[PDB]
């Protein structure tokens, strides 16, 4: 009971009948698709983000190697964009997939699947 959850598929949350005031929201893709990259060598990519919310949004991403990005945290303002760098070096050859869990100041969470098929090309 206390500890032990069977497991349920994630469901896109939805706002109630009405919701006003002040809220922060960013623009993030469903997942990061990394084309055929080198296994040993490290891979990187740029992810643009434009503050869509109404007030200052504060997101804090957390990840670990081989998945690592920066700035792990930042503050975007409504009516502006930014660029986030994501570093990922698949030390092992094969298919690597993960998930970027973002943390908001208000108390929200995000899910962004990761990818980066590595090959022994070298």
PDB file of C-alpha atoms in Angstrom:
ATOM      1  CA  UNK A   1       0.000   0.000   0.000  1.00  0.00           C
ATOM      2  CA  UNK A   2       2.093   2.881   1.317  1.00  0.00           C
ATOM      3  CA  UNK A   3       4.960   1.897  -0.980  1.00  0.00           C
ATOM      4  CA  UNK A   4       4.390   0.083  -4.260  1.00  0.00           C
ATOM      5  CA  UNK A   5       2.724   1.504  -7.362  1.00  0.00           C
ATOM      6  CA  UNK A   6       1.652  -0.733 -10.246  1.00  0.00           C
ATOM      7  CA  UNK A   7       2.160   1.918 -12.909  1.00  0.00           C
ATOM      8  CA  UNK A   8      -0.031   4.130 -15.081  1.00  0.00           C
ATOM      9  CA  UNK A   9       0.552   5.791 -18.452  1.00  0.00           C
ATOM     10  CA  UNK A  10       1.245   9.527 -18.288  1.00  0.00           C
ATOM     11  CA  UNK A  11      -1.712  11.746 -19.185  1.00  0.00           C
ATOM     12  CA  UNK A  12      -1.407  15.310 -20.482  1.00  0.00           C
ATOM     13  CA  UNK A  13      -2.687  17.458 -17.616  1.00  0.00           C
ATOM     14  CA  UNK A  14      -5.459  19.980 -18.260  1.00  0.00           C
ATOM     15  CA  UNK A  15      -6.477  23.288 -16.684  1.00  0.00           C
ATOM     16  CA  UNK A  16      -9.797  23.603 -14.809  1.00  0.00           C
ATOM     17  CA  UNK A  17     -12.923  25.349 -16.092  1.00  0.00           C
ATOM     18  CA  UNK A  18     -11.217  28.700 -15.520  1.00  0.00           C
ATOM     19  CA  UNK A  19      -7.713  29.766 -14.493  1.00  0.00           C
ATOM     20  CA  UNK A  20      -6.449  33.340 -14.195  1.00  0.00           C
ATOM     21  CA  UNK A  21      -3.668  35.194 -12.401  1.00  0.00           C
ATOM     22  CA  UNK A  22       0.026  34.660 -13.091  1.00  0.00           C
ATOM     23  CA  UNK A  23       1.631  31.532 -14.540  1.00  0.00           C
ATOM     24  CA  UNK A  24       4.889  30.639 -16.288  1.00  0.00           C
ATOM     25  CA  UNK A  25       5.171  28.384 -19.337  1.00  0.00           C
ATOM     26  CA  UNK A  26       7.999  27.573 -21.747  1.00  0.00           C
ATOM     27  CA  UNK A  27       8.210  25.973 -25.191  1.00  0.00           C
ATOM     28  CA  UNK A  28       9.897  22.564 -25.231  1.00  0.00           C
ATOM     29  CA  UNK A  29       9.776  19.799 -27.874  1.00  0.00           C
ATOM     30  CA  UNK A  30       8.437  16.287 -27.284  1.00  0.00           C
ATOM     31  CA  UNK A  31      11.897  14.716 -27.488  1.00  0.00           C
ATOM     32  CA  UNK A  32      15.434  15.287 -28.767  1.00  0.00           C
ATOM     33  CA  UNK A  33      16.269  13.331 -31.920  1.00  0.00           C
ATOM     34  CA  UNK A  34      20.025  12.898 -32.341  1.00  0.00           C
ATOM     35  CA  UNK A  35      20.979  11.722 -35.831  1.00  0.00           C
ATOM     36  CA  UNK A  36      23.626   9.036 -36.326  1.00  0.00           C
ATOM     37  CA  UNK A  37      26.444  10.248 -34.078  1.00  0.00           C
ATOM     38  CA  UNK A  38      29.817   8.782 -33.018  1.00  0.00           C
ATOM     39  CA  UNK A  39      29.914   6.480 -29.992  1.00  0.00           C
ATOM     40  CA  UNK A  40      33.252   7.558 -28.525  1.00  0.00           C
ATOM     41  CA  UNK A  41      33.144  11.194 -29.637  1.00  0.00           C
ATOM     42  CA  UNK A  42      30.700  13.485 -27.835  1.00  0.00           C
ATOM     43  CA  UNK A  43      27.577  14.983 -29.404  1.00  0.00           C
ATOM     44  CA  UNK A  44      25.870  18.342 -28.892  1.00  0.00           C
ATOM     45  CA  UNK A  45      22.866  20.318 -30.131  1.00  0.00           C
ATOM     46  CA  UNK A  46      21.096  23.658 -29.717  1.00  0.00           C
ATOM     47  CA  UNK A  47      17.527  24.002 -28.445  1.00  0.00           C
ATOM     48  CA  UNK A  48      15.757  27.343 -28.860  1.00  0.00           C
ATOM     49  CA  UNK A  49      13.184  28.353 -26.248  1.00  0.00           C
ATOM     50  CA  UNK A  50      10.743  31.269 -26.270  1.00  0.00           C
ATOM     51  CA  UNK A  51       8.924  32.287 -23.087  1.00  0.00           C
ATOM     52  CA  UNK A  52       5.215  31.907 -23.836  1.00  0.00           C
ATOM     53  CA  UNK A  53       3.990  32.350 -20.275  1.00  0.00           C
ATOM     54  CA  UNK A  54       2.739  35.661 -18.901  1.00  0.00           C
ATOM     55  CA  UNK A  55       5.343  36.213 -16.184  1.00  0.00           C
ATOM     56  CA  UNK A  56       9.005  35.361 -15.602  1.00  0.00           C
ATOM     57  CA  UNK A  57       9.468  31.603 -15.963  1.00  0.00           C
ATOM     58  CA  UNK A  58      12.086  29.699 -13.966  1.00  0.00           C
ATOM     59  CA  UNK A  59      12.880  26.183 -15.178  1.00  0.00           C
ATOM     60  CA  UNK A  60      15.502  23.868 -13.683  1.00  0.00           C
ATOM     61  CA  UNK A  61      16.585  20.780 -15.623  1.00  0.00           C
ATOM     62  CA  UNK A  62      18.428  17.885 -13.985  1.00  0.00           C
ATOM     63  CA  UNK A  63      20.407  15.155 -15.745  1.00  0.00           C
ATOM     64  CA  UNK A  64      23.589  13.084 -15.529  1.00  0.00           C
ATOM     65  CA  UNK A  65      26.122  11.594 -17.943  1.00  0.00           C
ATOM     66  CA  UNK A  66      26.292  10.432 -20.495  1.00  0.00           C
ATOM     67  CA  UNK A  67      23.438  12.943 -20.642  1.00  0.00           C
ATOM     68  CA  UNK A  68      24.416  16.467 -19.596  1.00  0.00           C
ATOM     69  CA  UNK A  69      23.271  19.939 -20.641  1.00  0.00           C
ATOM     70  CA  UNK A  70      23.693  23.582 -19.632  1.00  0.00           C
ATOM     71  CA  UNK A  71      22.835  25.924 -18.342  1.00  0.00           C
ATOM     72  CA  UNK A  72      21.085  23.332 -16.178  1.00  0.00           C
ATOM     73  CA  UNK A  73      18.896  26.250 -15.105  1.00  0.00           C
ATOM     74  CA  UNK A  74      17.852  29.631 -16.468  1.00  0.00           C
ATOM     75  CA  UNK A  75      15.281  32.424 -16.421  1.00  0.00           C
ATOM     76  CA  UNK A  76      13.528  33.551 -19.602  1.00  0.00           C
ATOM     77  CA  UNK A  77      11.296  36.608 -19.978  1.00  0.00           C
ATOM     78  CA  UNK A  78       8.027  36.851 -21.908  1.00  0.00           C
ATOM     79  CA  UNK A  79       8.641  38.091 -25.436  1.00  0.00           C
ATOM     80  CA  UNK A  80      12.146  36.675 -25.787  1.00  0.00           C
ATOM     81  CA  UNK A  81      14.028  33.532 -26.812  1.00  0.00           C
ATOM     82  CA  UNK A  82      17.156  31.635 -25.770  1.00  0.00           C
ATOM     83  CA  UNK A  83      19.511  28.817 -26.758  1.00  0.00           C
ATOM     84  CA  UNK A  84      20.181  25.721 -24.651  1.00  0.00           C
ATOM     85  CA  UNK A  85      23.128  23.410 -25.318  1.00  0.00           C
ATOM     86  CA  UNK A  86      22.751  19.674 -24.706  1.00  0.00           C
ATOM     87  CA  UNK A  87      25.861  17.500 -24.462  1.00  0.00           C
ATOM     88  CA  UNK A  88      25.615  13.716 -24.759  1.00  0.00           C
ATOM     89  CA  UNK A  89      28.483  11.316 -25.456  1.00  0.00           C
ATOM     90  CA  UNK A  90      27.361   7.675 -25.816  1.00  0.00           C
ATOM     91  CA  UNK A  91      30.396   5.845 -24.436  1.00  0.00           C
ATOM     92  CA  UNK A  92      28.643   2.609 -25.397  1.00  0.00           C
ATOM     93  CA  UNK A  93      27.528   1.627 -28.898  1.00  0.00           C
ATOM     94  CA  UNK A  94      23.802   1.206 -29.457  1.00  0.00           C
ATOM     95  CA  UNK A  95      20.524   3.022 -28.848  1.00  0.00           C
ATOM     96  CA  UNK A  96      20.497   5.457 -25.925  1.00  0.00           C
ATOM     97  CA  UNK A  97      17.233   6.985 -24.706  1.00  0.00           C
ATOM     98  CA  UNK A  98      16.392   9.044 -21.637  1.00  0.00           C
ATOM     99  CA  UNK A  99      14.141  11.785 -20.283  1.00  0.00           C
ATOM    100  CA  UNK A 100      14.787  15.396 -19.271  1.00  0.00           C
ATOM    101  CA  UNK A 101      12.852  16.198 -16.096  1.00  0.00           C
ATOM    102  CA  UNK A 102      12.434  19.966 -15.792  1.00  0.00           C
ATOM    103  CA  UNK A 103      11.550  21.610 -12.480  1.00  0.00           C
ATOM    104  CA  UNK A 104       9.561  24.844 -12.273  1.00  0.00           C
ATOM    105  CA  UNK A 105       9.608  27.341  -9.403  1.00  0.00           C
ATOM    106  CA  UNK A 106       5.819  27.138  -9.143  1.00  0.00           C
ATOM    107  CA  UNK A 107       5.949  23.365  -8.803  1.00  0.00           C
ATOM    108  CA  UNK A 108       5.601  21.808 -12.248  1.00  0.00           C
ATOM    109  CA  UNK A 109       7.418  19.044 -14.127  1.00  0.00           C
ATOM    110  CA  UNK A 110       8.268  18.338 -17.767  1.00  0.00           C
ATOM    111  CA  UNK A 111       9.089  15.217 -19.779  1.00  0.00           C
ATOM    112  CA  UNK A 112      11.364  15.196 -22.828  1.00  0.00           C
ATOM    113  CA  UNK A 113      12.535  11.849 -24.204  1.00  0.00           C
ATOM    114  CA  UNK A 114      16.191  11.690 -25.239  1.00  0.00           C
ATOM    115  CA  UNK A 115      17.873   9.975 -28.188  1.00  0.00           C
ATOM    116  CA  UNK A 116      21.251   9.491 -29.840  1.00  0.00           C
ATOM    117  CA  UNK A 117      21.854   6.262 -31.743  1.00  0.00           C
ATOM    118  CA  UNK A 118      25.588   5.623 -31.415  1.00  0.00           C
ATOM    119  CA  UNK A 119      27.677   3.562 -33.834  1.00  0.00           C
ATOM    120  CA  UNK A 120      31.127   1.963 -33.799  1.00  0.00           C
ATOM    121  CA  UNK A 121      31.863   3.808 -37.042  1.00  0.00           C
ATOM    122  CA  UNK A 122      35.124   4.609 -35.255  1.00  0.00           C
TER     123      UNK A 122
END
